């Protein structure tokens, strides 16, 4: 009989039951989407988009609903922290319900197409054999894809007839869904320009419409039909799998580096923002501008938004997690409650000292403090007998500006050292570690988990492309090579051209 | 030598549906007490 | 709700072990010569 890894090949010559199987697969995927959204709604805490946003809570599909304009709940909240909003039907809950209903309708259609598989439509009128005209099917589907692509860009993303898309400022403080005009100049190809996303779907959609019409009206050249085996449905599987792994690598890359379609308020900050001290530089710029305008140190730091400080913290870096450290980021360091304020360290001489921050590479990291020129001035020693830079010897203190601890100063060396240990993570926060029984170990965000799964799937689908492309081009030898294989075709010198019997010497 | 006491075993579709119903309904009944 | 932590595995095995027993018997019935 068929071995277990070939059971689905019974669909190759059965277009109707292939459609049934595709319907069932579509039903399962839509059903997963609906169930996933319901599970997230049953666990999402909407009460704090500042220090407990969706990406701290392990939310995977919620940011995708928000990205395209679904931001509200029937229960009255929105993900930007509003109360008493009316989303209409198209709340998170409505989206979930629609996917569940779609799943059911697709399941019913799958049953029909499985029972009524023997439709005259699927037969070649000449031969009476099962036949799909794949070249013309491609044109039809490409035309439809083009129309939908164009409509998505021209109506939904523009807000002309639709909600728009999520956009934000460069530091992810004031994100919201907005109408976005297309960008038709070279900046449209900037991955961070959302107007380029709008221009893409308008322009690519029109190209898809035109190419679709071409592929409906012009038959493939005989040379290409034979070489790619266009009468064989497995050729379509091969090249479709290739297109899909290309797309999957792309979305993995844009998730990891960031773009207009992977905003940090939905998926969390990127690792490169920690690497380049992106948020620290903006924080420092704002403090210095406050001081330049006459503010005290306490006022300047109290003017820093808690949301901006929270981005400048390594526990939100997606490159700090672990493969088997499961769940939301909140399960590790805890549910963030409040900024403690900016810690300023000083030695007994009164010089300001700076804690060396932990790079993402390091699971653990020493505590070393330098002056403004990078000269080491204090540390936490391992061996004590030859310590020279201990906090006790150097009289290290810490004062806090802004946040909970604003205006306070600590001099007790164990207390100063504890704050220094937190300062290697950047800005210091108070966490609720009890509600979730958090274990104190960093986890990655949806940005990290999305990137991992899609790079892995992309690589595996490369094998799929290789396999089905091989099956397509070598179909004649799938069961083995010719029993009467001419030895002259494989030995050297008989033919001038390899594998060409007409070139015998 | 082959054992002459062997017999084939059967479970028809209706019996499958009846058994699955019994198992699933028993599970729906007893699960609350397993979670307690 | 603070439910018994073994409730999940108990229910899962309660469903799956006898259901799988029946599925085995049904499928090997269908595959016998007709």
């Amino acid at each position: 009989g068929l071995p277990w890894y070939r059971v689905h090949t019974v669909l190759i010559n059965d277009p109707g039951r292939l459609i049934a199987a595709h319907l069932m697969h579509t039903a399962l995927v839509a059903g997963w989407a609906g169930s996933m959204a319901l599970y997230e709604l049953a666990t999402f805490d909407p009460s704090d988009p500042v220090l407990n946003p969706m990406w701290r809570q392990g939310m995977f599909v919620l940011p995708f609903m928000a990205r395209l304009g679904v931001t509200g709940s029937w229960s009255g909240w929105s993900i930007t922290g509003e109360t008493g909003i009316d989303p209409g039907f198209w709340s998170f809950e409505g989206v979930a319900l629609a996917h569940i209903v779609l799943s059911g309708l697709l399941f019913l259609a799958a049953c029909w197409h499985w029972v009524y598989w023997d439709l005259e439509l699927f037969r070649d009128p000449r031969t009476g054999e099962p036949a799909l005209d794949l070249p013309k099917m491609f044109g039809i589907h490409l035309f439809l894809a083009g129309l939908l692509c164009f409509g998505f860009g021209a109506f939904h993303l523009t807000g002309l007839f639709g909600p728009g898309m999520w956009v934000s400022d460069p530091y992810g403080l004031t994100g919201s869904v907005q109408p976005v005009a297309p960008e038709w100049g070279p900046d449209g190809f900037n991955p961070y320009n959302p107007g380029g996303v709008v221009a893409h779907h308008i322009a690519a959609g029109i190209v898809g419409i035109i190419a679709g019409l071409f592929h409906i009206l012009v038959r493939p050249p005989q040379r290409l039909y034979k070489a790619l085996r266009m009468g064989n449905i497995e050729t379509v599987l091969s090249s479709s799998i290739a297109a899909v792994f290309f797309a999957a690598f792309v979305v993995a890359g844009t998730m990891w580096y960031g773009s207009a379609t992977t905003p940090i308020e939905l998926f969390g900050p990127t690792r490169y923002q920690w690497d380049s001290s992106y948020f620290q530089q903006e924080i420092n710029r704002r403090v210095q501008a406050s001081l330049a305008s006459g503010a005290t140190l306490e006022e300047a730091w109290s003017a820093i938004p808690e949301k901006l400080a929270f981005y400048d913290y390594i526990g939100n870096n997606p490159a700090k997690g672990g493969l088997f450290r499961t769940g939301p980021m909140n399960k590790g360091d805890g549910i963030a409650q409040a900024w403690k304020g900016h810690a300023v360290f000083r030695n007994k001489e009164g010089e300001e000292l700076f804690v060396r921050r932990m790079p993402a590479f390091f699971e653990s990291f020493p505590v070393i403090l330098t002056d403004k020129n990078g000269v080491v001035k204090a540390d936490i020693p391992f061996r004590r007998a030859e310590s020279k830079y201990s906090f006790e010897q150097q009289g290290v203190t810490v004062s806090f500006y802004g946040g909970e601890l604003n205006g306070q100063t600590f001099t007790d060396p164990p207390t100063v050292k504890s704050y220094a240990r937190k300062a290697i993570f950047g800005e210091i926060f108070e966490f609720d570690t009890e509600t979730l029984n958090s274990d104190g170990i960093f986890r990655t965000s949806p940005r990290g988990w999305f990137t991992f799964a899609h790079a892995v799937f992309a690589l595996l689908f490369f094998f799929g492309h290789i396999w089905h492309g091989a099956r397509t081009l070598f179909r004649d030898v799938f069961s083995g090579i010719d029993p009467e294989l001419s030895p002259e075709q494989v030995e050297w010198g008989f033919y001038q051209k390899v594998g060409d019997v007409t070139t015998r010497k | 030598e082959p054992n002459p006491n062997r017999q084939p075993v059967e479970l028809n579709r209706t019996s499958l549906y009846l058994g699955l119903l019994l198992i699933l309904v028993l599970a729906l009944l007893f699960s609350s007490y397993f979670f307690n | 709700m603070e439910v018994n932590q073994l409730g999940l595995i108990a229910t899962a095995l309660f469903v799956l072990v006898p259901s799988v027993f029946l599925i085995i018997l049904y499928v090997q019935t269908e595959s016998q010569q007709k």
């Binding site: 049953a42 | 579709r13 549906y17 119903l21 699933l24 599970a27 | 709700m1 409730g7 999940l8 469903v15």
Partner: peptide, 30 residues
Amino acid sequence: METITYVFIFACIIALFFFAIFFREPPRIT
């Protein structure tokens, strides 16, 4: 997890109803 378990078993039962009715062994007169 308990709610998921209860709803899962319920959903399996409803699925069984569907197969038991529409994919029954057809009654045949011999």
